[PDB]
Symmetry: C5
Subunit: 206 residues, 5 copies
């Protein structure tokens, strides 16, 4: 009965929350982004493509997802399918293959309205690995950002400019020399609204 | 702020509630098409296939998607999944693999009824790269157009005949010597009505 | 108002129109034709060949007939191929799942004709020995219904000559000839005859 | 007009049959077990990969079973004796290759033929990569490989798996294959594990082949 | 026989209309037992340090909400159901380099005490340096499996043994197995007061 009780309290919370159209200029949203780089799998010098495996941490906060734990049996967080909630359209801008998702698509929602979503991904992107067989290595970069929302609708932030490297694969064919993730504001001539991306820059060698 | 979210939900609800059944000879449609070439990833002379990554910009305008911003809290635009609305069946005529989609598929609808849809794609198509190792380079071409709508239903237009190369990957294995996109009208033995395509012609070398 | 009127006539038509497939009492004729675009690849290590082609399919249902005069003079419309019955026509010696290159949309006309032309890439069983010679190599593949006999689905072509007017002029392979021949198979097992179209292609580097 | 009405009449009778056929069958059980007959038609050995010991087969897998819940009297349904239906509309057995190395690839539509006595015939074409050492294929004696097929989750108390013959049908084998078949058999096997009182049934496909 | 089918359908209707199970929580936690049956090391790629494994992954858990008295249901003790019809754990490989490939139907066995048995066959590419596979000591690689979003306070992981089942290992694989273990690990992250659990698969092999 106590188990049924706690299950009922969670079902009641989720039912209440699921009964938000995305950010707008009137209701903008900040998304925090961070990369945990696991592996440089392949560097292909015949096509100038490089394959990364990483965890992409995304976090945003919505008033529509807030609740008072006292009103819901002291539940402070829950797990739901990422398809049950809005998620940002953050995309690599210079990929050469569809990203491959390696993990279940499940987000964690906290009572303050906070959402954490961390998909693991394999990405092929445009990168000339010339010099990777040298001491100074090779340098490659790829920008991530919303596909359809400007800086007036989604702002992008990092908690740090240092890519988390504490899970990089120790026996990779490639050693990481540096890995940074840097927010950039762009002003294009096409458009008066600013655009935001996070630039991932990785220096590596064999 | 719940007010602005409610205004956007009211607009979307009004718009989604005659449904637009696609264009016809009595209600024809003009689709504007343009390419922004990012990369020639691979040119395979053993099979005469070449792989291209590009943005394909598509734009059209529908009365049924118009609204007065005054009646909807001055909302001027919104975002919706491309699967939630009619989109044109623009197709490469001479691909050799199903096109790969590299971006979210989200359209931007604006209050004048116009729709902007810009998928990023990777495409393999029939292309003989003989001469790519020479100064004159190699020239290839591929037509894009509606698969099943004639020019009396979907007409195509370009805003320029010059393919934008400013996002072309500077360290590609191949450099672009020229890239044009040209509207064509074609009649076919099969079918009584002309079909419209845009011919994408690219000249490139190592 | 005029554009809303025509959109409403189309939606009324589609609504009114929206069959358990064919049977021996209610049989169906499918017309089939091939437009061969490219022999992409001829793999002598596995005796597989990859073709790219348009496959014209056409059939007629009384259940999709209408009088244009009752529907604002509409003579035809477009609809998703997953919204209507389509025949189970299949290559009999493929070695990979066919790859679909075109959107799956059919044309329907007021006489009840359905018209469907998927672009496709097909790997199929083919020994290319001889392709590096003047006589070339020759390969064949049969197309037909998977589960319907000739008493349920009859296959017809409009001609035995494959359409080569869109063959890729710079292919690695040149086409010496390409034919698409209706065949009636009579088996002793079964009272019903079976029907395929045999696609025969002779080609060389 | 009369012809039109005859056509609609037969259509209505078939729609009535399928609507009538569709207590729902919940799959087989120890109380209501089921026999599934399995036979293979080998079309082609496409590829033998000696660097990974994987071999690729194209074949038709014939499956047959009979359900009381699919019977009907043709007299009650306009003399209809059989119909075609998508394999997703009915229960189908979970017959699986036990040592595949890639997901099976389906090459044909997934359509079953249901006959008025309740017998179902389902013949999908498939491409399968499975574990196989091709050492000897470049010799006159050839190489021999095997793969077991069986239900993934039903024991012999729920699904009895049978063959009609040990002889794999080779009459459609591709005459210009890179590999010629020396023999191919399909044999029912019963395993008992001491863990569990229930038997477990597979059909073992054994193929001996060599470079052409 | 119609009566036994109606009993099974009655049971399945009663279980699937029960409040709905929302997944495990701190207050309603769950233990998942994991075990691997290793069939084949298909491929070891030294140019990318990726290795491909084929295995069966046994998963077992128990839910109050799937319990029933066989006496109320014609002595039915178990049934088969699609894995999409029940809650299943988000068990994931932490260092794969391609999406896992599923080789078996996604069907589970549910038992009257509420236990679920689900055993997918899988092909997995994961991060592994095969240097030494050409030698007598062989090479050694490891990959963790665990929930993707659930802590040890919601999903505990157990193995029934630490010895990977090698009884179905392919005898003519390009590679032989020197040893293979599956070890529960308790993992503490500075982010979080709750422990995280994984099962570490360690395989030593050689040509
Ligand atoms: C290249 N298209 C194809 C070219 C083609 C096409 C047939 C051979 C050889 C190159 C795409 C591309 C644009 C132009 C023609 C387009 N198109 C759309 C359709 C639909 N359609 C049919 C389909 C099957 C059978 C008959 C018809 C039919 C009859 C009248 C009007 C339209 C028809 N047919 N062709 C298809």
């Amino acid at each position: 009965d106590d188990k049924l009780h706690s299950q009922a309290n969670l079902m009641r919370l989720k039912s209440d929350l699921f009964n938000y159209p995305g950010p707008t200029k009137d209701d903008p949203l900040t998304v925090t982004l961070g990369f945990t780089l696991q592996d440089i799998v392949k560097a292909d010098s015949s096509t100038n493509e490089v394959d990364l495996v990483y965890y992409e941490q995304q976090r945003w906060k919505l008033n529509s997802l807030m609740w008072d734990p006292n009103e819901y049996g002291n539940i402070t967080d829950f797990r739901t399918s990422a398809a049950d909630i809005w998620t940002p359209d953050i995309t690599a801008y210079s990929s050469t293959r569809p990203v491959q998702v390696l993990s279940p698509q499940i987000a964690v929602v906290t009572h303050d309205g906070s959402v954490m979503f961390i998909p693991a991904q394999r990405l092929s992107f445009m990168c000339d690995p010339t010099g990777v067989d040298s001491e100074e290595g090779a340098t490659c970069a790829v920008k991530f950002g919303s596909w359809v929302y400007s800086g007036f609708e989604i702002d992008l932030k990092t908690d740090t400019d240092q890519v988390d490297l504490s899970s990089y694969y120790a026996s990779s064919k490639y050693e990481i020399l540096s890995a940074t993730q840097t927010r950039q504001v762009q002003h294009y001539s096409c458009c008066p609204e600013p655009y935001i991306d996070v630039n991932l820059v990785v220096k590596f060698r064999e």
